[PDB]
Design a protein around this ligand. Structure first.
Ligand SMILES: [Mg+2]
Lengths: 308, 53, 232, 62, 16, 74, 92, 181, 149, 71, 54, 41
RNA sequence: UAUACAAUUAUCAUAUUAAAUUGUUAAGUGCUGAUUUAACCAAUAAAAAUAUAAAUAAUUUUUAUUUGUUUUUAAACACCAUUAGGUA
RNA sequence: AUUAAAAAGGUAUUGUUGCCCACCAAUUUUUAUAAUAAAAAUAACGUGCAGUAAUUAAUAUAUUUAUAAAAAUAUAUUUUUUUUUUUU
């Protein structure tokens, strides 16, 4: 693991005199820590052991340099170095150790380490439980980061092309709309800066007229249509082609059309409840009339078929 | 000893809290005299916690 | 037995001898259910009576004739006061509120083994190391933290007349001025009333106890009200 | 049944006399079930089982 | 399964 | 089982002082005299003018060994 | 503190092994247990044994000649002690 | 078989003792006590002092108890905790006796002070044996010789209790006929 | 000190001992490690019996102390090699030198200093205090002057 | 800690701490600092049931000095 | 330390080769000089008897 | 254990009456339950 | 037949924030033979020893999963046999 | 001239000539109609003596044996009555 060089570039840009001093004193022992601004925290110097900066090991022997090099770090030290390297690339500032991004990357690395350890030796039920708890915490951190920003998501989730993490736990809970209820409960229910992501003028409805958001969009000439898969596009095309097909079919081949019209005309006579009374008008006949569903009628077997 | 039940209950509480709060007053399984030296590969030699199994 | 008849006030079940003490600072009022500190019934209670009661440095209930928690300073500031007045008994240089004490059930646990004299799970974080290794390894040619001045916060409170600044006025051992209710809308006149005695205190330290016209009128009203009180 | 029927704040899990009446029921149930299990297992050694076996025997044709 | 003194009443046996 | 011989006659260690507390006697004698059909005793007639101190709670209720309840016994 | 380099490894090893050569004009350094082990000559042969272990050494395996090693007496530290010891030797 | 097992070191036609003996032996690294017996110190007294040490330290008790029979870990923990609690209670009981004996010593010292007051300091010293009649050095030398011989402290070890072999050996560390649970 | 092994080996010939030490050193340096120091004691007399080639108890052995700094991955392999080497009668591993039980948690205090000062030897006496005083004073006098050359 | 357990409130724990301190004969009680708890303490002080109260501007807790009469 | 020493061979599995030499470091309860905080009561009753006999 | 729980003392009658500020009878008197049947004749 | 538990502590199956897991050592005669046990007794009989510093308390345990049967050298060893052995 | 002088228990109240245990034996009830199974009441019989500090302690789970209480093992407990070591 190595530090990104954006830190060196930023330090040289911010402090020209100190950077030039370091460059001119390269290879010479230094009694004053010019790199204090370069290394605000202990975790920000993970190249060498014990948070020793590279510039400090200048007037010392190559034996000491090798002993403090990366090749002499323990497993825990290597894990912490990798964690710090990943965290500093997502932290909003040097001291950012509470943001959901840094929390998520730290928890993800810890989960990876725990999974590797469990693959080696799986007889640690304590490790299994702590891995489950860390996975839960990582899921919560990512759910919280979702609402604050998603550019970080399209930056981080491309790691190994996961694109499927934060999967809903179960269909029974997901159907009742409790998977998205976490955003409501976390206080990030509605915080997206809607105006920047899309035009908010056509995303609402007129109270005075009562027309829906779609009606407002069509009146304003806008179209808020989500990306569509193949099946819905096929359905739309098939339904659109209906009038064009029928207009030519009726003219070209009126025989079959007239036969079907005769059949429908006689079917309307020979049916059930030709009068449009309340019984026939009942949109959900089995649900409305249940007391006669067992002994009077046999057509329906279940009293309800939909959510209502 | 049975007039000092509270002290041993505290000991058991400490052990239970240590082992993820699952096993209360449970001890690790007995192992053979040379269990760490005569058991073949793939078998646990050092006894584990009653929760770890 | 009394436990068989009355069970709402007494619990004879083992592992529940801790009680239902609400006077602790723990996250739950059930001491036997809390999992922060575990009672060592065999050795605790040396200076706090029973083993289940909170320690002297972790108590939130105070008697009438018992000293309160000393202030940690970490005399110099008593020059203006009586020269022969020694160090204030309520000022301690080493006082840790959350100072963990060694407990056998939590720290030196031996139930897993046969409880032999030679074994037992022990953690060394509870008590500071007495080994001479400490100072020798932590011996440096350069001076210590107080000389190097690496602390910028200082005291948590901005200005303490007892610690940070010189101390003026008169000492108040019993909490009398610190436990009182203001009788004036501007909180300049304060009053503490017992069953028969009423004490009225002027609190204007910003102006060296100087009274304005409105303050003097309010003070006169309070004086002639407290003097003309029935039980005064 | 309810083995731990001791009164409120009983310093013991149960009562020795009360536990015997439950142990007797458990022992009797286990004994009768074990005896019936052994009998129905020994049913397989009757010659009727041999007749069933020879009836279930298949034909091996070369 | 119910112990019952036949010679003397149970309450009379119990009220020691 | 083993039980101490005098466990049955063991005094209650938490409420054996409330009976002998001076304030209980003071209040009961005050009510009894105020009923109007009881000749006041000399101790009541004297201690009505000099009631005992208020803050002398016993260690049984204080459960704090470092409390100096009695100024005389301090 | 100087680590042993790869190039000087054999020289360091030879010096470490020759730290006990059964013959010197200066006292031998103690080991990590503060003891005086057997003084060995070249090519790995025990030739001197301290008097404390002398009886055990001669009992475990006989006909194994080994002069009982005696620590070098201190004379440069204090000259008067050397004269006293020589006078004691003369007086027997 | 372990070296402490009941059928260990058995003498039989088919049984051959394991390990090498003599010089560097099987017990060469496992000998707990080694003493160089010297003239004027009998080996019987050496063995007596060693046995008294290992008995008063409650170590032979544990050795026999763990060696002869097998006892469950629960039983061993129960016995050890009972022993610890009984020892603590006995220490608490004996502290009061020590305090009262110190008080009685104070009373004896007060009576000695009363005797000093009623007889004179010099008279009390003479009664205590002050060398006020030691005209020559030999007179005080005789008492110096007496106290020098009295200072000689012989070994204070006492005879160890015997071991009782009860039938079926319910308890193996039993050293007295008193019955125990 | 990162790691410190203590080995007991047969009192072989000088050539054989040198060959074994060369093999151990080559094995250590192959994994890109650094030996902090290696000290050799004499032919000691261990209490426990260690069996020789002829399955007989040999009560004489030679002690070697090997202080070094290597990563865990390479340390496992090197320790396995040293333990499986025939000449090494027995090897003991010391791993808690970085964080001894006597120790906000400054790690560089014990890593720089050798194991000898971490674990005082029996022959040490009171004069080591005066020796420490003299060494500390000279080092604090000369360290920056020698560093800024 | 669990669903079955009652959902405790600052008013509830303040009341129980005050009651326990009263039963144990204490002088000062440290009680949680909320607007409702401070109002309750002020009303009790006004009615004389409590010797006094002080809201030290600490986010967690404030102090209440109790009163006793005739033992 | 005992485990490490036994494993390496520096310490015997049973007994101590410095029990006699460690007696000076071990505290000695002199019979002549009384200690007020003695664990045993005989060391106090002997001094009581001595004073009474005087 | 088989027995139910019993209070140490009574519940204050004033508190018991005060906790009944939203009982079903009070709700009916306030008119919260909407009427859809015929009710009394 | 209708007509007011508790919530300050309740022993039989309601576990849910917890640091675990893994170390490679010990013991090796055959000799003229009565060991163990209340008693009988069976066949080489001696043996396996290393720790701490370090893992956040939380707002979706609603979520993986988990509580002394866990398979081989010795020592232990329950059915059954009776001159007396097998068997975790 | 070697001696009396400690602790330590009712499941019994008809109070050991006691409660109590299954089996055996006898009457009968309830669920059930399936050649079922299960559960409950009962003063005298027969085999015993399992439990009740109760004659090799008792409790819990697992295995096993069977005229019956139960018994023996593996593991975990004591509603088992208890006996003094603060660096020899
Ligand atoms: Mg019986």
């Amino acid at each position: 693991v190595n530090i990104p060089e954006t830190r060196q570039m930023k330090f040289e840009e911010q402090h020209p005199l100190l950077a030039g001093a370091l460059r001119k004193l390269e290879g010479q022992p230094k009694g004053f820590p010019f790199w204090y601004r370069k290394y605000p925290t202990r975790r920000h110097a993970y190249e060498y052991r014990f948070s020793i900066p590279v510039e400090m090991l200048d007037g010392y022997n190559d034996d000491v340099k090798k002993a403090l090099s990366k090749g002499m770090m323990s497993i825990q030290e290597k894990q912490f170095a990798q964690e710090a390297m990943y965290m500093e690339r997502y932290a909003e500032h040097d001291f950012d150790t509470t943001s959901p991004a840094v929390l998520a990357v730290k928890r993800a690395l810890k989960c990876r380490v725990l999974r590797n350890h469990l693959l080696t030796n799986p007889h640690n039920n304590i490790i299994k439980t702590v891995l489950a708890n860390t996975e839960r915490k990582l899921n919560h951190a990512l759910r919280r980061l979702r609402k604050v920003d998603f550019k970080k998501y399209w930056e981080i989730i491309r790691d190994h092309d996961v694109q499927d993490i934060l999967q809903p736990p179960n269909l029974v809970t997901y159907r009742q709309g409790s998977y998205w209820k976490y955003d409501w409960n976390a206080g990030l229910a509605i915080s997206t800066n809607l105006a920047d992501v899309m035009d908010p003028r056509g995303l609402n409805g007129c109270v005075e007229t009562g027309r829906s958001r779609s009606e407002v969009a069509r009146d304003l000439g806008l179209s808020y249509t989500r990306p569509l898969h193949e099946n819905e596009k096929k359905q739309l095309s098939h339904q659109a082609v209906y009038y064009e097909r029928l207009a030519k079919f009726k003219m070209e081949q009126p025989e079959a059309a007239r036969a079907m019209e005769r059949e429908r005309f006689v079917r309307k006579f020979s049916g059930m409840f030709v009068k449009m009374d309340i019984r026939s008008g009942a949109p959900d006949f089995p649900s409305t009339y249940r007391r006669l569903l067992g002994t009077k009628v046999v057509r329906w077997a279940s009293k309800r078929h939909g959510p209502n | 000893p049975h007039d000092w039940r509270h002290f041993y209950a505290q000991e058991k509480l400490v052990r239970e809290r240590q082992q993820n709060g699952h096993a209360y007053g449970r001890r690790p399984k007995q192992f053979s005299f040379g269990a760490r030296y005569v058991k073949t590969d793939g078998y646990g030699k050092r006894p584990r916690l009653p929760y770890n199994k | 037995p009394i436990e068989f008849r009355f069970y709402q006030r007494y619990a004879n079940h083992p592992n529940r001898q801790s009680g239902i003490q609400f006077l602790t600072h723990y996250n739950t009022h059930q001491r036997f259910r809390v999992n922060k500190d575990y009672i060592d019934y065999m050795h605790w209670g040396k200076e706090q009576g029973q083993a289940r009661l909170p320690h002297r440095h972790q108590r939130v209930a105070f008697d009438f004739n018992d000293q309160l928690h000393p202030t940690r300073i970490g005399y110099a500031w008593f020059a203006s006061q009586d020269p022969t007045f020694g160090h204030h008994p309520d000022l301690s240089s080493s006082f840790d509120p959350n100072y963990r004490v060694f407990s056998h059930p939590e720290h030196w646990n031996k139930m897993f083994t046969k409880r032999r004299p030679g074994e037992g799970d022990i953690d060394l974080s509870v008590l500071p190391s007495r080994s001479l290794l400490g100072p020798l390894m932590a011996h440096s040619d350069t001076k210590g933290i107080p000389y190097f001045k690496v602390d910028n916060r200082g005291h948590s409170n901005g200005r303490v007349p007892g610690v940070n600044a010189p101390f003026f006025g008169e000492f108040d051992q019993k909490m009398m001025q610190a436990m009182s209710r203001p009788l004036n809308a501007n909180r300049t006149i304060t009053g503490n009333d017992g069953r028969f005695s009423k004490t009225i205190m002027i609190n204007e330290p910003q102006c060296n106890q100087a009274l304005s016209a409105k303050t003097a009128s309010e003070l006169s009203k309070e004086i002639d009200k407290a003097t003309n009180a029935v039980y005064s | 049944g309810q083995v731990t029927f001791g009164p409120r704040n009983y310093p013991y899990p149960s009562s020795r006399w009360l536990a015997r009446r439950f142990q007797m029921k458990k022992h009797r149930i286990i004994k009768r079930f074990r005896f019936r299990r052994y009998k129905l297992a020994a049913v397989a050694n009757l010659p009727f089982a041999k007749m069933i076996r020879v009836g279930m025997l298949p034909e091996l044709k070369s | 399964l119910h112990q019952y003194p036949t010679a003397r009443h149970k309450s009379l046996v119990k009220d020691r | 089982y083993k039980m101490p011989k005098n466990m049955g006659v063991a005094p209650r260690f938490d409420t054996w002082n409330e009976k002998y507390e001076p304030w209980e006697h003071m209040k009961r004698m005050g009510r009894l005299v105020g009923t109007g059909f009881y000749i006041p005793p000399e101790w009541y007639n004297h201690f009505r003018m000099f009631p005992p101190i208020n803050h002398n709670f016993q260690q049984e209720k204080t459960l704090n060994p470092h409390n100096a309840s009695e100024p005389t016994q301090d | 503190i100087n680590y042993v380099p790869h190039a000087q490894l054999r020289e360091h090893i030879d010096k470490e092994l020759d730290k006990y050569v059964a013959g010197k004009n200066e006292p031998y350094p103690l080991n990590f247990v503060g003891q005086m082990p057997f003084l060995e000559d070249g090519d790995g042969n025990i030739v001197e044994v301290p008097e404390s272990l002398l009886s055990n050494h001669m009992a475990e395996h006989p006909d194994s000649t080994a002069k009982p090693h005696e620590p070098h007496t201190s004379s440069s530290i204090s000259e008067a002690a050397a004269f006293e010891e020589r006078m004691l030797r003369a007086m027997v | 078989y372990m070296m402490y097992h009941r059928k260990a070191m058995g003498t039989m036609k088919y049984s051959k003792w394991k390990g090498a003996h003599g010089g560097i032996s099987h017990f060469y690294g496992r000998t707990p006590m080694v003493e160089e017996v010297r003239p004027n110190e009998p080996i019987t007294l050496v063995d007596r002092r060693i046995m008294h040490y290992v008995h008063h330290s409650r170590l032979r008790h544990f050795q026999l108890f763990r060696s002869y029979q097998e006892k469950s870990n629960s039983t061993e923990c129960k016995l050890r905790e009972g022993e610890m609690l009984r020892r603590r209670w006995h220490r608490r009981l004996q502290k009061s006796f020590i305090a009262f004996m110190q008080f009685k010593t104070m009373k004896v010292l007060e009576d000695q002070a009363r005797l000093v007051n009623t007889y004179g300091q010099a008279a009390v010293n003479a009664a205590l044996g002050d060398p006020w009649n030691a005209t020559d050095n030999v007179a005080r030398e005789r008492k110096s010789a007496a106290v020098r011989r009295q200072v000689r402290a012989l070994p204070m070890v006492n005879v160890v209790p015997k071991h009782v072999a009860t039938m079926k050996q319910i308890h193996n560390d039993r050293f007295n006929y008193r019955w125990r649970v | 000190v990162f790691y410190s092994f203590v080995l007991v080996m047969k009192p072989r010939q000088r050539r054989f001992t040198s060959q074994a030490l060369r093999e151990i050193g080559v094995a250590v340096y192959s994994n890109g490690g650094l030996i902090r120091s290696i000290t050799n004691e004499g032919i000691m007399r261990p209490y426990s019996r260690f069996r020789d080639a002829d399955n007989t108890p040999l009560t004489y052995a030679r002690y070697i102390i090997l202080q070094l700094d290597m990563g865990e991955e390479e340390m496992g392999k090197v320790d396995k090699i040293i333990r499986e080497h025939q000449d090494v009668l027995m090897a003991l591993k010391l791993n808690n030198l970085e964080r001894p039980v006597g120790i906000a948690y400054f790690p560089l205090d014990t890593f720089t200093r050798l194991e000898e000062e971490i674990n005082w030897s029996p022959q040490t006496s009171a004069d080591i205090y005066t020796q420490l005083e003299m060494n500390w004073k000279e080092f604090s006098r000369t360290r920056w002057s020698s560093f800024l050359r | 800690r669990r669903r079955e357990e009652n959902l405790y409130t600052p008013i509830y724990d303040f009341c129980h701490r005050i009651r326990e301190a009263t039963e144990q004969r204490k002088r000062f009680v440290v009680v949680p600092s909320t607007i409702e708890t401070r109002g309750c303490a002020r009303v009790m002080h006004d009615h004389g049931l409590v010797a006094g109260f002080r809201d030290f501007h600490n986010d967690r807790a404030f102090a209440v000095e109790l009163k006793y009469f005739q033992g | 330390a005992k485990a490490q020493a036994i494993r390496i061979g520096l310490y015997p599995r049973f007994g101590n080769p410095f029990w006699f030499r460690s007696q000076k470091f071990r505290p000695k309860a002199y019979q002549e000089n009384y200690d007020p905080t003695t664990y045993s009561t005989k060391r106090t009753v002997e001094h009581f008897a001595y004073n009474w006999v005087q | 254990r088989s027995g139910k729980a019993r209070a140490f003392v009574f519940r204050d009658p004033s508190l018991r009456m005060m906790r009944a500020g939203s009982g079903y009878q009070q709700l009916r008197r306030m008119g919260m339950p909407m009427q859809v049947g015929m009710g009394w004749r």
